[PDB]
Design a protein around this nucleic acid. Sequence first.
DNA 1: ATTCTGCATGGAT
DNA 2: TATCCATGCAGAA
Length: 111
Amino acid sequence: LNLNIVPLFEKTLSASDAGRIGRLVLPKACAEAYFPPISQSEGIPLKIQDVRGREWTFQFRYWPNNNSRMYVLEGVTPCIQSMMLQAGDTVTFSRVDPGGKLIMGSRKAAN
DNA sequence: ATTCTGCATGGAT
DNA sequence: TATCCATGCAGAA
């Protein structure tokens, strides 16, 4: 029974990502790199656990963009606001190996 | 007015 | 020139 937390990537929140809309933008590069692959514009549900138990479930989804894709987690506001985040705070996504569990955390604006 | 969608745009680099 | 994500924006309800 030997486990490790492996950083995947971080996102520093925009107005949009922090705002009322509820969708958080993932750099395409990063999404394809560390989240499941998905081939439909409307993706798959994705359960990410926070440090203190709470499973959040977002639809992980893309759209066509230019000739590529734009990625988002949808329905984040509950998660965000539980964690008290504003634009300029940072959300870190990580993976627990061996296994494929997705976990997350966040930290507050530099100031 | 408002919110949800599903993109499309274009400023930043 | 190029990429590409923050934000715009036009339905639909």
